[PDB]
Amino acid sequence: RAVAVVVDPIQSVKGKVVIDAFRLINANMMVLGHEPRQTTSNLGHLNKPSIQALIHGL
Amino acid sequence: APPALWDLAADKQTLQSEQPLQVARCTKIINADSEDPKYIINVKQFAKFVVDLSDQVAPTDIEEGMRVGVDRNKYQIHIPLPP
Amino acid sequence: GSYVGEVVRAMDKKKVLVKVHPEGKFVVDVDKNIDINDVTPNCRVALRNDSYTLHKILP
Amino acid sequence: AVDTAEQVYISSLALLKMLKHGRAGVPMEVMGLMLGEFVDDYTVRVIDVFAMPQSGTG
Amino acid sequence: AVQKVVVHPLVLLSVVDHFNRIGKVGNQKRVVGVLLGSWQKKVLDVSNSFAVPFDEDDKDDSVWFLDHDYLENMYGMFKKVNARERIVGWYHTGPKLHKNDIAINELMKRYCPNSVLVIIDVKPKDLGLPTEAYISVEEVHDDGTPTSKTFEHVTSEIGAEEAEEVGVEHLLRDIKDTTVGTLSQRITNQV
Amino acid sequence: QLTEEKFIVKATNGPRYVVGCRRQLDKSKLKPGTRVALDMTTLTIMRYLPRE
Amino acid sequence: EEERSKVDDLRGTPMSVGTLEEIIDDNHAIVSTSVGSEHYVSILSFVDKDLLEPGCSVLLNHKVHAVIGVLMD
Amino acid sequence: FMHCGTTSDQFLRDNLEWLARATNWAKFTATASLGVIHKGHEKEALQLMATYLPKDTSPGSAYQEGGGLYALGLIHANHGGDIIDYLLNQLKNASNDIVRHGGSLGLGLAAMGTARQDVYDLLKTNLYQDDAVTGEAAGLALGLVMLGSKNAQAIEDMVGYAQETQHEKILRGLAVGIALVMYGRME
Amino acid sequence: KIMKSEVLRVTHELQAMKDKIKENSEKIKVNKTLPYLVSNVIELLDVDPQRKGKCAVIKTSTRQTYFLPVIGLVDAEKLKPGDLVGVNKDSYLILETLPTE
Numbered sequence: 062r063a064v065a066v067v068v069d070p071i072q073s074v075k076g077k078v079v080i081d082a083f084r085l086i087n088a089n090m091m092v093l094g095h096e097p098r099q100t101t102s103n104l105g106h107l108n109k110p111s112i113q114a115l116i117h118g119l
Numbered sequence: 120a121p122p123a124l125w126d127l128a129a130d131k132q133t134l135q136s137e138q139p140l141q142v143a144r145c146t147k148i149i150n151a152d153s154e155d156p157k158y159i160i161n162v163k164q165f166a167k168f169v170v171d172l173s174d175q176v177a178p179t180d181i182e183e184g185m186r187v188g189v190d191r192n193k194y195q196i197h198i199p200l201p202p
Numbered sequence: 203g204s205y206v207g208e209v210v211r212a213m214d215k216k217k218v219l220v221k222v223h224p225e226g227k228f229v230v231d232v233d234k235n236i237d238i239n240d241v242t243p244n245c246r247v248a249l250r251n252d253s254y255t256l257h258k259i260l261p
Numbered sequence: 262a263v264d265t266a267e268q269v270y271i272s273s274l275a276l277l278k279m280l281k282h283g284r285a286g287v288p289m290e291v292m293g294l295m296l297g298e299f300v301d302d303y304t305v306r307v308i309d310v311f312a313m314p315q316s317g318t319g
Numbered sequence: 320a321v322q323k324v325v326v327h328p329l330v331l332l333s334v335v336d337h338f339n340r341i342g343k344v345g346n347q348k349r350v351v352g353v354l355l356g357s358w359q360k361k362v363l364d365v366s367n368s369f370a371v372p373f374d375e376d377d378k379d380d381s382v383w384f385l386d387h388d389y390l391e392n393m394y395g396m397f398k399k400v401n402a403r404e405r406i407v408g409w410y411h412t413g414p415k416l417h418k419n420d421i422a423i424n425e426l427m428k429r430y431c432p433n434s435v436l437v438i439i440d441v442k443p444k445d446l447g448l449p450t451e452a453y454i455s456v457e458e459v460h461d462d463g464t465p466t467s468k469t470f471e472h473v474t475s476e477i478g479a480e481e482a483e484e485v486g487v488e489h490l491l492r493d494i495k496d497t498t499v500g501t502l503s504q505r506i507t508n509q510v
Numbered sequence: 511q512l513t514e515e516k517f518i519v520k521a522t523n524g525p526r527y528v529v530g531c532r533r534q535l536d537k538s539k540l541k542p543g544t545r546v547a548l549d550m551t552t553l554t555i556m557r558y559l560p561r562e
Numbered sequence: 563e564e565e566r567s568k569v570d571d572l573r574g575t576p577m578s579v580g581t582l583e584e585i586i587d588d589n590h591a592i593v594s595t596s597v598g599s600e601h602y603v604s605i606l607s608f609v610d611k612d613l614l615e616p617g618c619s620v621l622l623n624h625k626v627h628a629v630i631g632v633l634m635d
Numbered sequence: 636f637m638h639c640g641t642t643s644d645q646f647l648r649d650n651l652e653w654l655a656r657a658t659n660w661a662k663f664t665a666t667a668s669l670g671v672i673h674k675g676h677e678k679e680a681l682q683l684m685a686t687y688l689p690k691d692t693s694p695g696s697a698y699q700e701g702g703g704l705y706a707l708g709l710i711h712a713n714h715g716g717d718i719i720d721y722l723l724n725q726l727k728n729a730s731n732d733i734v735r736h737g738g739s740l741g742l743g744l745a746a747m748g749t750a751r752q753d754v755y756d757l758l759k760t761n762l763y764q765d766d767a768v769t770g771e772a773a774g775l776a777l778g779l780v781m782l783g784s785k786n787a788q789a790i791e792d793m794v795g796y797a798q799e800t801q802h803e804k805i806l807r808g809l810a811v812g813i814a815l816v817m818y819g820r821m822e
Numbered sequence: 823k824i825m826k827s828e829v830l831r832v833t834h835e836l837q838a839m840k841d842k843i844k845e846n847s848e849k850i851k852v853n854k855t856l857p858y859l860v861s862n863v864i865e866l867l868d869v870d871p872q873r874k875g876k877c878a879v880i881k882t883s884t885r886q887t888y889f890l891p892v893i894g895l896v897d898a899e900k901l902k903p904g905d906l907v908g909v910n911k912d913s914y915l916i917l918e919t920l921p922t923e
């Protein structure tokens with residue numbers, strides 16, 4: 062599993078404490094579809110990281 | 120684009136080769152050297168820096184006021200260059 | 203916030219060179235909901251500061 | 262060849278350890294370790310989180 | 320000497336951890352954690368703490384078990400990661416002050432400086448403030464009774480620094496803020 | 511100084527900011543004409559900066 | 563066609579216009595800009611490198627400045 | 636939706652390359668939707684599910700089998716000629732979380748409303764491994780089987796089984812599980 | 823010599839102190855590894871009314887001014903308004919000062 066988390070209160074305001082846990086994809090999964098994650102309900106909540114350079118920029 | 124065709128097929132290994140060769144601290148030239156670890160260096164943006172030599176370059180391959188390739192992350196001297 | 207783009211020349215490959223504040227001159231495709239030909243060159247526009255997508259023409 | 266739908270359980274223990282660690286989020290890179298138990302494939306629970314002393318390497 | 324203390328909610332949340340890491344044994348005693356804080360200013364400021372395996376006897380109160388090596392190692396590694404905070408005192412989570420607590424206190428009066436004691440509650444059913452700072456001082460008595468270690472209450476406030484406010488307020492979404500006017504005034508004026 | 515607590519600062523590098531007052535220090539040295547010292551976090555004032 | 567449209571990531575939003583200084587036979591050239599940023603990348607497609615006529619303005623990035631193409635003027 | 640009841644596999648006879656192309660739960664939902672297509676067939680259903688790999692008798696993907704039972708329960712919903720007797724020996728077969736999960740779904744759905752204490756019992760030992768997905772199926776079947784029965788130790792068994800675990804799919808499966816039992820207990 | 827046999831505990835304390843200076847002296851090498859840039863120093867004594875006033879004025883080579891007290895190790899040939907000093911990344915501290923010319 063090997064969870065990786067970045068806390069960054071420096072540019073995070075005191076109103077929201079938005080933190081995210083990040084993941085590594087396998088490099089051999091590039092031929093198939095990227096993330097075969099079932100139960101796609103919560104991804105509407107996972108599009109809250111929508112900064113227009115970092116999330117889909119990287 | 121036909122010259123960029125075979126090079127476009129040769130752009131596959133440029134992604135596995137993009138993780139090496141990436142480093143450039145704007146090719147800072149040195150000024151002097153106080154002792155064989157510590158080198159007094161100046162970047163072109165007028166910030167005087169000090170870093171140690173890496174293991175890949177000999178200190179006899181250090182020349183006074185030399186433009187060389189140098190890291191922008193660990194800041195060490197990966198490879199030199201002739202001019 | 204976001205930056206202030208100024209297009210000086212529109213490029214025909216739908217990748218508009220835009221004159222930016224120093225260390226700028228960032229050539230980019232602007233957002234898909236806005237057409238390229240409406241953006242007239244030598245006029246100031248509204249540009250995002252990272253994603254480099256145009257909002258509107260400015261006087 | 263399998264992947265599932267995982268979701269990360271976060272206590273306030275780990276949270277305020279990352280917030281004391283975020284007050285310890287001065288400009289330098291800081292280090293810490295997340296602990297807990299993996300009960301299945303697709304759920305993950307954190308309990309124990311501590312910090313690590315800094316180094317000039319980061 | 321010291322007028323007031325400041326205890327951050329992080330350590331009491333680690334007393335929630337004291338009631339987490341039990342493992343269901345049937346003991347649930349006054350588990351002592353090693354209180355850390357800032358005695359540096361005249362006000363005492365608790366930042367964080369840890370806990371130590373502590374056992375008493377069923378019948379005998381005066382049997383009590385601590386560790387110096389665990390104190391110097393956990394405090395050593397903690398001082399290695401953060402030397403801006405030092406040892407200050409301790410606490411038991413039991414509701415009752417035992418006779419043994421002068422002797423249990425005496426170990427951290429020796430090796431640490433004048434240590435503060437905190438009585439808190441195992442079950443937070445008390446409407447009152449759970450934390451009471453009891454200064455460990457010997458006071459001379461007018462009746463002529465011999466001088467002993469006496470636990471006088473030092474007044475306390477529970478404050479959070481910056482991010483503990485944000486994380487707690489994000490975790491709740493149930494508490495309402497200051498909100499002067501009808502409601503937050505009149506509810507205090509209710510109860 | 512607009513609010514007696516909170517005023518305008520002028521950095522050496524050029525950008526201007528507004529800061530608060532620390533609970534320890536008082537308004538004696540905080541009068542204008544005083545070059546001060548600031549922090550990256552919260553823009554607090556630990557002490558001032560005497561010119562020379 | 564997909565390989566023609568896979569280098570779009572480099573010429574996308576992370577793209578800048580720099581000024582080339584010289585072309586090096588070690589295939590990593592040295593560039594410049596308003597601060598004169600010198601970054602050397604082993605070359606990529608769409609560049610001419612002979613009629614490129616060094617000392618001119620070329621196309622750079624917000625990324626590692628891999629030269630994805632050139633633009634005449 | 637469109638091929639329900641008309642038993643038309645002929646749309647899904649266009650290709651094998653668009654169905655089995657991914658080893659995932661998508662094949663389980665594909666075999667399930669195959670169960671939605673045809674219904675009410677006492678020989679050709681089990682025969683047709685047996686037709687899919689009677690070669691080595693070892694599916695590399697278990698979702699064909701567990702979708703065979705989950706589909707089969709969709710076929711035999713409220714049939715009086717239940718093959719439930721065979722599916723107890725088929726749930727007696729040792730397999731991980733597809734005979735357990737899909738076997739709980741299909742077998743409990745075919746046993747819907749019967750209020751049998753036996754399928755109640757094997758349902759309990761299906762949920763006693765504390766896994767979220769197969770016990771989620773155990774709750775979903777348990778609401779089906781206990782319709783109107785209102786067994787006394789069952790409700791306190793479910794809510795007493797609820798707070799003693801940190802898994803969440805056991806909580807929603809027992810959520811619907813204690814939901815469906817309560818019918819006409821308005822009073 | 824019974825009164826002088828308490829000296830043994832003192833010597834075990836002090837050789838224990840020599841056992842425990844190895845780690846906090848060991849972090850000297852990993853914190854003070856690379857002074858990354860060169861920054862101009864201007865010495866300016868402060869007054870705090872211990873609470874003693876002691877300060878210096880810094881200027882980076884990229885001409886950015888920050889604030890700091892007199893810090894580092896025991897200084898004799900330091901305290902000069904000079905250059906070629908030791909500094910970490912954002913700590914902006916003084917660790918190793920050297921003469922430029």
Ligand SMILES: [Zn+2]
Pocket residue numbers: none
């Ligand atoms: Zn960094």
